[PDB]
């Protein structure tokens, strides 16, 4: 337990220690934000522990100590709330207010938004909640929206909705560059297993590819490997129109092709339309393949295989 | 009290008994008001009222309960199943359903007179009704139709021979 007087004494130690920490580092105590405290505590008390919640921290007591409910009865002993003896005066005072607004409507007559999660509702109510209790409250809110809710009602419902940052699965085009001669090209990078490739694709060419200074058909004797190099250009009907100059390092025979295929495709996205770039994405030409070799375990012959098991 | 360790079971039972307390009425603060005879499940307890100085002649468990209540003198005989938990649940049951002298007068609106051999024929008024005293007497009954106990009748007739009754024991 931490009282209100105790918290008030912690607020005074942070303010004083916040002025000392600026005197150490030579900063202005006035314009000393919390971002500068975290940077100065990491220089003076360097900890490389992987868990960031186990490193030295000097924050504001309102962010360290958990929020605690105020006292619910006075000296005489009478509680301050009429729903006290329920044990959930905050949860039921909310359900009573919502159900009272649904009676008024009957009388006188989303992409970014997401319903508040359970763990985020307890903080608002400072109450411990079950799962089935969370669902009941969500059912009234949805029922409130269907009805012709007034302006004041919308503001209430928006206290229990949280915005969502919708990511965009749209490839990032590379900036087209120009060489000394004036030819346009675009550079990208690919990675397959341990192979890493840098590809330079010229805007105009006669379908020539050179890997590490060697023509592609000599560097890749196997037909399968050359098929991979052809896949990006064939899909967009651009065979015999560009000149590629790449450099692949590491990996093996087939891993270097997939690494080159990916770089050529990424750099080929600058000389094509957006609709084609989306098609290349839906075909698996712009995605880095995460399948890498798995480690062997002790007590096993391989990553997943086991030693021969004898029952008797 | 129930628990895995014996020291933890003593606390639960002790601290939980004060919240289930009875109040037992006593005649002159040394014994009960009348003879009690009940049966809790299979366990029979037949307590009797006795005068001062008789002492406690009852089951060792009842001796320990009575001292807690404050009953100095009373006789009790346990029969049937001697189970410490039914013996206790029945003892507290009969000691709470006993009718005092004041309730009896109020019930019948008559004087409760005490007759003692030591005080001769003197009638001692122990309780009188608070309300209107009835003017008519109780109809005298030629023969009462009250169920008797062969154990008590066999003793009054000098027929209950036992080499274990009326033994010299320590003070209780």
């Amino acid at each position: 337990t931490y009282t209100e007087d105790f918290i008030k004494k912690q607020i005074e130690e942070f303010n004083i220690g916040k002025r000392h920490l600026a005197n150490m580092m030579g900063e202005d105590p006035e314009t000393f934000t919390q971002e500068d405290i975290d940077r100065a505590i990491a220089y003076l008390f360097p900890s490389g522990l992987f868990e960031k919640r186990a490193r030295p921290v000097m924050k504001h007591p309102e962010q360290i100590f958990p929020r605690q409910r105020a006292i619910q009865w006075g000296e005489d002993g009478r509680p301050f709330h009429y729903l006290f003896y329920t044990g959930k005066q905050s949860y039921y005072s909310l359900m009573h207010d919502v159900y009272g607004m649904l009676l008024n409507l009957e009388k006188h007559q989303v992409i970014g938004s997401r319903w508040l999660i359970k763990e985020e509702l307890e903080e608002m109510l400072v109450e411990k909640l079950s799962d089935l209790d969370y669902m009941q409250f969500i059912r009234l809110l949805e029922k409130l929206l269907t009805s012709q809710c007034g302006a004041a009602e919308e503001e209430f419902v928006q206290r229990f909705r949280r915005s969502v940052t919708l990511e965009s699965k749209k490839q990032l085009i590379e900036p087209v560059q120009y060489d000394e001669q004036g030819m346009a090209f675009s550079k990208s990078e690919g990675k397959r297993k341990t192979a890493k490739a840098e590809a330079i694709v010229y805007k105009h060419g006669s379908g020539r590819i050179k890997v590490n200074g060697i023509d592609y058909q000599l560097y890749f004797p196997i037909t399968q490997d050359r098929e991979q190099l052809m896949f990006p250009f064939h899909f967009v009907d651009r065979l015999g129109k560009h000149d590629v100059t790449c450099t692949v390092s590491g990996g093996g025979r087939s891993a270097q092709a997939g690494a080159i295929r990916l770089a050529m495709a990424k750099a080929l996205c600058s000389f094509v339309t957006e609709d084609e770039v989306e098609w290349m994405r839906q075909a698996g030409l712009l995605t880095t393949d995460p399948r890498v070799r798995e480690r062997k375990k002790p007590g096993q012959e391989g990553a997943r295989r086991k030693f021969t098991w004898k029952k008797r | 009290g129930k628990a895995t360790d014996r020291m933890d079971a003593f606390r639960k039972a002790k601290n939980r008994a004060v919240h289930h307390l009875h109040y037992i009425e006593r005649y002159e603060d040394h014994t009960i008001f009348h003879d009690i005879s009940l049966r809790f499940k299979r366990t029979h307890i037949k307590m009797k009222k006795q005068p001062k100085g008789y002492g406690l002649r009852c089951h060792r468990a009842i001796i320990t309960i009575c001292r807690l209540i404050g009953i100095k003198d009373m006789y009790a005989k346990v029969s049937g199943s001697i189970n410490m938990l039914s013996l206790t649940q029945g003892l507290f049951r009969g000691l709470s359903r006993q009718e005092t002298h004041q309730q009896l007068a109020d019930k019948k609106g008559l004087h409760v007179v005490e007759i003692r051999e030591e005080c001769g024929p003197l009638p001692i008024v122990v309780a009188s009704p608070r309300g209107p005293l009835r003017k008519d007497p109780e109809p005298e009954d030629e023969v009462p139709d009250v169920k008797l106990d062969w154990e008590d009748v066999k003793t009054a007739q000098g027929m209950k021979r036992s080499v274990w009754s009326n033994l010299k024991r320590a003070a209780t």
């Binding site: 900890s47 490389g48 522990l49 992987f50 868990e51 186990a54 | -």
Partner: protein, 132 residues
């Protein structure tokens, strides 16, 4: 079951310290190292002699300050120096602490042939992380 450096749960009446409450799989995630030197770094030498010195120091100080250590030691090496940092209790008299600081600092300097310094931090009672 695994047992190394684990304090088995109990009814809830057993106090434990922070270091004593975390197992070996937390040594670089929620704990640090009680000894800090260069022996165990790549290309470095004399990791075996620095270990025998540590084992002896933790026992010398446990029997030199009997019943006074509140938590494990923290050995630190900066070149030739050897810094012993200890958390001790406040039962013993300061007169006797100053005696043992000078007796140990001196005895260990002549044994290991290095300047040795001892840093005490008194606490009223053994700090408790939680109760198991």
């Amino acid at each position: 079951k695994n047992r190394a450096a684990r304090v088995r749960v109990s009814k809830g009446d057993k106090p434990v310290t922070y270091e004593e409450a975390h197992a070996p799989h937390y040594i670089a995630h929620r704990k640090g190292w009680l000894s800090l030197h260069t022996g165990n770094l790549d290309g470095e030498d004399h990791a075996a002699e620095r270990t025998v010195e540590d084992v002896f120091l933790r026992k010398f100080m446990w029997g030199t300050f009997p019943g006074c250590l509140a938590d494990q030691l923290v050995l630190k090496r900066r070149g030739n120096q050897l810094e012993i940092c200890a958390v001790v209790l406040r039962q013993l008299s300061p007169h006797k602490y100053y005696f043992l600081v000078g007796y140990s600092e001196t005895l260990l300097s002549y044994f290991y042939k290095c300047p040795v310094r001892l840093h005490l931090q008194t606490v009223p009672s053994k700090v408790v992380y939680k109760y198991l």
